[PDB]
């Protein structure tokens, strides 16, 4: 089966026609005097040349102005002398946006396993606000398998060639497909052809229910679009001889590098990658040193924080970027605050999820502070090479089902006990019921990803306690003045909100966010909220 | 032997207790007035940077050791950009505010050497304060003082090493010191590219028989001009897919695969700049997808829409200087010729407008070979370097020439397709740059362009052949930027 939706009216709102009305009436003219040129059944003259893409938009402006003027005062209704459908058109088109519960509805049946597509009487917009159309088309691009623009194939609606063509392409029966239009007039030949006829009047809503009817039912407030994965661009920068950083790119300027934590990947930002791009940013979801597709040198000094933060600038340098908004989480969160602290120039901004900014005490061995905190026992476990590796690597499937679990779920990790029992996955089963937070596929990704690096490299992040301490002690007399945002997770066992109360001592103006009922895996666990926040922040500052 | 420079006022001009350490790095900026503008209002010293890349290219160890500071300022980015840019030309960056030891504290000099790993006589220090050069000469270093805006300066420079020009070529990005993108637009098909700079986007599209490396001279500059550059490897070339089938290189297919490329990358609009064959594609991009095109620029290639009542083929058969195009028309043949010895093949193709050893564009069929007239070991063009050539060899050693040649082999359908937009006009911003001495693709072939593209802005480079970019880069840049800036 397949679903195909018209853009203006069903996937995109408010229909361009809408404004055609409030311009007709607005300009006091005979019902459909203007919507005539647009949709009427007998497309002739200029607009027929338009949807067929014989002439572009700007051309069609004059041709149509004058053609209106014919039927104008020179045939009933008084159309002003100095009148033009150009600015009313481009503005109503620019002022039109995506029908989420619809696009949402579309992504569903695609997930369900449907043939998702759009069939619209399009045109080639060479206008000033020609971009608006491009963005709407850029982002809609993913969700649909096929795009049949009247202005590309040369057969406007409701001429049958298009419908008869919509099928040859979809290679299917007309009953096999369902047609969503907002004119009904374009729907007549669709029904008559043995296809499903659903008039998208309203704003979906009801057409969403007489829609639920066949196929299935759709969410109430679904999950934000997660970039997923072969469909993405893959960057590769070589910052130093043996060392190269892999990453994923989406969206256009300005730049914001998403840095992940232990034991994850760039795929962790899957839910934020798209949205943020769409938020109007060039996203760079990077695979941190030692992870997935970037270099994983075995040596430990190789993961010193000083080294990673510097290798971070080298990364921007080679890419030719002078400044980025750094958004860290978990371990990276640390790095990220360090980025802000040591390279403010290259940092347009900083955001940390869960990780507070915890500068060291000069008169307190770094090690002792770990030995003291009871919930950092695992950190000590890790401290020894070969050991934790051996445990985590043994059966990667469990290892992840174990680590990634919600705040309200059993099958946990032994952050407290670790050392005694000799593991974190020592009291965990050998078949952890898969978290309601991940999918077997999502898990499998991480497996393959780690099947390439093992865990040494990632673990070595922990193993630099001392020098990391020695280094960061250099900025104890500094303040973090570039824009910062700290987001805390209510139920994150290690890395608890409480660990940040004294943050403003160093980071005044530090703006803040807080997600409730949320565990460690902030992004994967409460994405929509993570997004809302991150965007608002980016927009606002 | 190595060389050091001091940002403070040597690689960047106009020159610029509690400061005794802001520099050492204990305190930041705002951790402190009208001095920020001063920093902003300052920039790179091109002959110095030039001089530097010279020595770097001469096989020296290039570096900067400066009394820095950390900027949490508002005009912070200015510093980034300068630093972002200088970065590629220096090996080590010894910034006071980083290793904690301002100049002239002798620890820095001691450290620059331990870092550099060499004798103090093996290096030459370039400071503009001289009071910072005492210890340097003291240590047994080579001290040059930056008094003039770098004249008698880089003069004493030329002395110690050798001669750097005055009006030089613009810095050429490379080689693998660049980012490498990879997008998979369709099952077997993926497009490789190179990225530099931050927004907005401009995709540089190359011609036959080249690569993204062809834009080497424009890639940096343009980034620095304030743009996110995407020097792409066209279908069939270098690191992107090279499917053997011909239909696979139809123009309609490439222009569409072009939108797919922007889509996956999440970009809604780009400025498309084409040259040679791509130039064609690029104008088609403008013609079929104006939405995704913020702009269009073509180098050499005019916009030549087809005649409905004139078989496309006949127009090639008619023009005498498109004989080679006919040669190419047959599969296996031209491949076999060009592939045989790639070294010659490129030395032959890439030559200036004022050089012999040419290509048989005219008599290709007749002599049966676009190289038959070409020497056997073409004296390497003064326009390329053995290394630059070698790049292209390896690049093509991966795809052969079928894929690239198939660009030619779609004459008919390309015609049939483009005939769809004969009733259209190109209204998005366009710029046509013509090359005086480009044998095929002569300026003359564009006089009627505005018939279709009014407002079409224009540029023209003199004494220039086909390889516009490689041949007259600085002029190409000047123009492309001015255009981008202005529109
Ligand atoms: O796996 C981790 N890893 C945390 C590293 C935290 C950290 C990073 C940097 C400095 C101090 C602490 N945390 C989760 C595991 C599942 C239960 C709750 C904590
Ligand atoms: O290699 C080429 N290739 C040109 C393809 C030109 C073209 C492509 C599409 C439409 C019209 C013309 N040109 C050089 C060859 C060596 C001598 C100068 C021209």
mmCIF file with all atom_site columns, C-alpha atoms and ligand atoms in Angstrom, chain B residues 208-209 276-277 280 301-302 304 322 324-325 328 348-349 358-361 370 408 438-441 445 466-467, ligand 2:
data_model
loop_
_atom_site.group_PDB
_atom_site.id
_atom_site.type_symbol
_atom_site.label_atom_id
_atom_site.label_alt_id
_atom_site.label_comp_id
_atom_site.label_asym_id
_atom_site.label_entity_id
_atom_site.label_seq_id
_atom_site.pdbx_PDB_ins_code
_atom_site.Cartn_x
_atom_site.Cartn_y
_atom_site.Cartn_z
_atom_site.occupancy
_atom_site.B_iso_or_equiv
_atom_site.pdbx_formal_charge
_atom_site.auth_seq_id
_atom_site.auth_comp_id
_atom_site.auth_asym_id
_atom_site.auth_atom_id
_atom_site.pdbx_PDB_model_num
ATOM   1  C CA  . UNK B 1 208 ? 36.365 17.492 -17.866 1.00 0.00 ? 208 UNK B CA  1
ATOM   2  C CA  . UNK B 1 209 ? 38.770 15.959 -17.237 1.00 0.00 ? 209 UNK B CA  1
ATOM   3  C CA  . UNK B 1 276 ? 33.386 23.327 -18.195 1.00 0.00 ? 276 UNK B CA  1
ATOM   4  C CA  . UNK B 1 277 ? 30.791 20.559 -18.277 1.00 0.00 ? 277 UNK B CA  1
ATOM   5  C CA  . UNK B 1 280 ? 26.332 23.369 -18.181 1.00 0.00 ? 280 UNK B CA  1
ATOM   6  C CA  . UNK B 1 301 ? 30.603 27.753 -20.332 1.00 0.00 ? 301 UNK B CA  1
ATOM   7  C CA  . UNK B 1 302 ? 27.843 29.917 -21.705 1.00 0.00 ? 302 UNK B CA  1
ATOM   8  C CA  . UNK B 1 304 ? 23.502 27.362 -24.762 1.00 0.00 ? 304 UNK B CA  1
ATOM   9  C CA  . UNK B 1 322 ? 33.984 20.042 -31.496 1.00 0.00 ? 322 UNK B CA  1
ATOM   10 C CA  . UNK B 1 324 ? 36.974 15.716 -30.323 1.00 0.00 ? 324 UNK B CA  1
ATOM   11 C CA  . UNK B 1 325 ? 33.470 15.655 -28.910 1.00 0.00 ? 325 UNK B CA  1
ATOM   12 C CA  . UNK B 1 328 ? 34.647 10.786 -27.504 1.00 0.00 ? 328 UNK B CA  1
ATOM   13 C CA  . UNK B 1 348 ? 48.701 17.576 -22.513 1.00 0.00 ? 348 UNK B CA  1
ATOM   14 C CA  . UNK B 1 349 ? 45.307 18.753 -21.314 1.00 0.00 ? 349 UNK B CA  1
ATOM   15 C CA  . UNK B 1 358 ? 48.146 21.183 -27.354 1.00 0.00 ? 358 UNK B CA  1
ATOM   16 C CA  . UNK B 1 359 ? 45.118 18.932 -27.888 1.00 0.00 ? 359 UNK B CA  1
ATOM   17 C CA  . UNK B 1 360 ? 43.625 18.016 -31.290 1.00 0.00 ? 360 UNK B CA  1
ATOM   18 C CA  . UNK B 1 361 ? 40.079 19.341 -30.727 1.00 0.00 ? 361 UNK B CA  1
ATOM   19 C CA  . UNK B 1 370 ? 43.005 13.770 -29.316 1.00 0.00 ? 370 UNK B CA  1
ATOM   20 C CA  . UNK B 1 408 ? 29.582 13.683 -23.651 1.00 0.00 ? 408 UNK B CA  1
ATOM   21 C CA  . UNK B 1 438 ? 39.584 29.538 -24.627 1.00 0.00 ? 438 UNK B CA  1
ATOM   22 C CA  . UNK B 1 439 ? 39.617 27.801 -27.982 1.00 0.00 ? 439 UNK B CA  1
ATOM   23 C CA  . UNK B 1 440 ? 36.434 25.707 -27.602 1.00 0.00 ? 440 UNK B CA  1
ATOM   24 C CA  . UNK B 1 441 ? 34.034 27.610 -25.345 1.00 0.00 ? 441 UNK B CA  1
ATOM   25 C CA  . UNK B 1 445 ? 29.382 31.819 -27.721 1.00 0.00 ? 445 UNK B CA  1
ATOM   26 C CA  . UNK B 1 466 ? 40.275 26.821 -20.665 1.00 0.00 ? 466 UNK B CA  1
ATOM   27 C CA  . UNK B 1 467 ? 41.650 26.008 -17.254 1.00 0.00 ? 467 UNK B CA  1
HETATM 28 O O1  . LIG C 2 .   ? 38.429 19.152 -22.498 1.00 0.00 ? 2   LIG C O1  1
HETATM 29 C C1  . LIG C 2 .   ? 37.609 19.994 -22.885 1.00 0.00 ? 2   LIG C C1  1
HETATM 30 N N1  . LIG C 2 .   ? 36.311 19.687 -22.692 1.00 0.00 ? 2   LIG C N1  1
HETATM 31 C C2  . LIG C 2 .   ? 35.260 20.597 -23.102 1.00 0.00 ? 2   LIG C C2  1
HETATM 32 C C3  . LIG C 2 .   ? 33.832 20.129 -22.880 1.00 0.00 ? 2   LIG C C3  1
HETATM 33 C C4  . LIG C 2 .   ? 33.070 21.326 -23.391 1.00 0.00 ? 2   LIG C C4  1
HETATM 34 C C5  . LIG C 2 .   ? 31.545 21.411 -23.451 1.00 0.00 ? 2   LIG C C5  1
HETATM 35 C C6  . LIG C 2 .   ? 30.700 20.678 -22.618 1.00 0.00 ? 2   LIG C C6  1
HETATM 36 C C7  . LIG C 2 .   ? 29.276 20.832 -22.756 1.00 0.00 ? 2   LIG C C7  1
HETATM 37 C C8  . LIG C 2 .   ? 28.706 21.715 -23.721 1.00 0.00 ? 2   LIG C C8  1
HETATM 38 C C9  . LIG C 2 .   ? 29.556 22.460 -24.563 1.00 0.00 ? 2   LIG C C9  1
HETATM 39 C C10 . LIG C 2 .   ? 30.964 22.312 -24.430 1.00 0.00 ? 2   LIG C C10 1
HETATM 40 N N2  . LIG C 2 .   ? 37.987 21.160 -23.485 1.00 0.00 ? 2   LIG C N2  1
HETATM 41 C C11 . LIG C 2 .   ? 39.399 21.589 -23.761 1.00 0.00 ? 2   LIG C C11 1
HETATM 42 C C12 . LIG C 2 .   ? 40.247 20.430 -24.404 1.00 0.00 ? 2   LIG C C12 1
HETATM 43 C C13 . LIG C 2 .   ? 41.735 20.876 -24.728 1.00 0.00 ? 2   LIG C C13 1
HETATM 44 C C14 . LIG C 2 .   ? 41.804 22.188 -25.623 1.00 0.00 ? 2   LIG C C14 1
HETATM 45 C C15 . LIG C 2 .   ? 40.831 23.344 -25.121 1.00 0.00 ? 2   LIG C C15 1
HETATM 46 C C16 . LIG C 2 .   ? 39.383 22.819 -24.740 1.00 0.00 ? 2   LIG C C16 1
#
